[PDB]
Structure 1
Amino acid sequence: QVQFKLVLVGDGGTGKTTFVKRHLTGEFEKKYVATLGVEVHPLVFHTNRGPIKFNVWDTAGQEKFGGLRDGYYIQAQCAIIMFDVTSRVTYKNVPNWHRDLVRVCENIPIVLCGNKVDIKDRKVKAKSIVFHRKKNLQYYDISAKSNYNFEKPFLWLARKLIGDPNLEFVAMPALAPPEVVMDPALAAQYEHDLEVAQT
């Protein structure tokens, strides 16, 4: 089976667990790891070159005691660093999560995700999101609760992991029905703000 360990890191409360739980089978088939304080979610996606499985390591909350232990990271093949777009301090900590990540795994492909963009009073805007630009990463706005851009980080990762740019997902995974509707107005504005920042 084509399988990658994906570690999901970032400040406590950014919505890392809410995000991974959108993938319904991934939540139903998760495996708790005694030693490590971790739940590992098998997120399978179906691409035009066959199935791929992201084994997502979600923390049990230990990041809310200080940077989790070293074994959580080892043998990761890819990563998502999350922050919260309504809390600047979580954005300020990205370089730290990245430092730890690169300290234990080297140059694994890494997607940066700004979460909770369904929330109207957004604090960390496209213009201020520059970290991915310097450290060679991919950035996406997401809203875990509305499934907004859910597939994007995993499509970009699959593209990088497999070595292929035209790779598509042939079918969407079954996702938790949205708990908020992502405001189409807000989506358009954000997409416009990103395109502008990027030029």
Structure 2
Amino acid sequence: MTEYKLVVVGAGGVGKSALTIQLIQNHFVDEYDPTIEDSYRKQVVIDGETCLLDILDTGGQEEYSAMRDQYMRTGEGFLCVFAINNTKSFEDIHHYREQIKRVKDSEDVPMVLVGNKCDLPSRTVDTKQAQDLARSYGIPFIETSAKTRQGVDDAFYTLVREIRKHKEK
């Protein structure tokens, strides 16, 4: 049973918690709307291997986090989440990636670009835009919806697979 330290980053309001809660929910509680950063666990089987995922639901750059730097040192992979109807949240991706490279002193950090809220017909960030940005970073791009659960599990599974590939380099 391998452990993976996952960290979700992005501007506030993009759906970092909705994604994390939908992934880890055992649904004992009907509704859970966390506003404070926290860590969640889920045991999942990926490609036959039982994985133990620790997912850190970080707050946006606005919310102060004393352990932010340490969270990124411990983190092995990062979900960079933006909202396809929020152009600023998409532009903010550069800030969060630079923040990760600054602390980990590397350009080869496992990451996945996540365009959340793909359930909304009206979007401002085209698929080509995000796919192009992901290419410039050398990381995968996945569209997700924390409402319809579209691509939610695949986003985290993809990141785990990115960590495993990186670790086997």
Partner of residue 171, structure 1: none
Number of residue-to-residue matches in the alignment: 155
Alignment of 1:145-156 (within 5 A): 145-156=147-158
Change (3 A) 1:71 1:163: closer
CA RMSD of aligned residues (A): 2.3
In structure 2, the residue corresponding to 1:52 is in which secondary structure? Answer: strand
- Gapped regions of structure 1 (runs ≥ 5): 29-36, 165-199
Give yes or no for contact 2:113–2:140 (8 Å, CA) kept in 1: yes
Partner of residue 12, structure 1: 12
Give distance in 1, aligned partners of 2:93 and 2:162.
Answer: 21
Change (3 A) 1:162 1:46: same
Partner of residue 31, structure 1: none
Return the TM-score normalized by structure 2: 0.81
Alignment of 1:17-32 (within 5 A): 17-23=17-23, 24-25=25-26
Structure 2: which amino acid aligns with 1:50? E
Change (3 A) 1:5 1:91: same
Instruction: Please state how far the C-alpha of 1:62 moved relative to its aligned partner.
Output: 5.4
Partner of residue 97, structure 2: 98
Over 3 Å off, 4+ runs: 25-28, 65-69
Change (3 A) 1:159 1:146: same
Instruction: Please state how far the C-alpha of 1:66 moved relative to its aligned partner.
Output: 6.2
The answer to whether residue 123 in structure 2 is matched with residue 122 in structure 1 is: yes
Give distance in 1, aligned partners of 2:163 and 2:28.
Answer: 23
Change (3 A) 1:27 1:66: farther
Give yes or no for contact 1:21–1:27 (8 Å, CA) kept in 2: no
Alignment of 1:27-106 (within 5 A): 38-59=37-58, 61=59, 63-65=61-63, 69-105=68-104, 106=106
Give yes or no for contact 1:111–1:153 (8 Å, CA) kept in 2: yes
In structure 2, the residue corresponding to 1:46 is in which secondary structure? Answer: strand
Instruction: Please state how far the C-alpha of 1:14 moved relative to its aligned partner.
Output: 0.5
Matched residues, percent identical? 23
Partner of residue 140, structure 2: 138
Give distance in 2, aligned partners of 1:113 and 1:82.
Answer: 5
Instruction: Please state how far the C-alpha of 1:18 moved relative to its aligned partner.
Output: 0.7
Give yes or no for contact 1:88–1:123 (8 Å, CA) kept in 2: yes
- Gapped regions of structure 2 (runs ≥ 5): 30-35
Give yes or no for contact 1:26–1:44 (8 Å, CA) kept in 2: no
Q: Deviations over 1:7-38 (max 9, x none)?
A: 1000011000011000213997xxxxxxxx63
Return the index of the structure with the highest Cα Rg: 1
Give yes or no for contact 1:26–1:42 (8 Å, CA) kept in 2: no
Give yes or no for contact 2:9–2:80 (8 Å, CA) kept in 1: yes
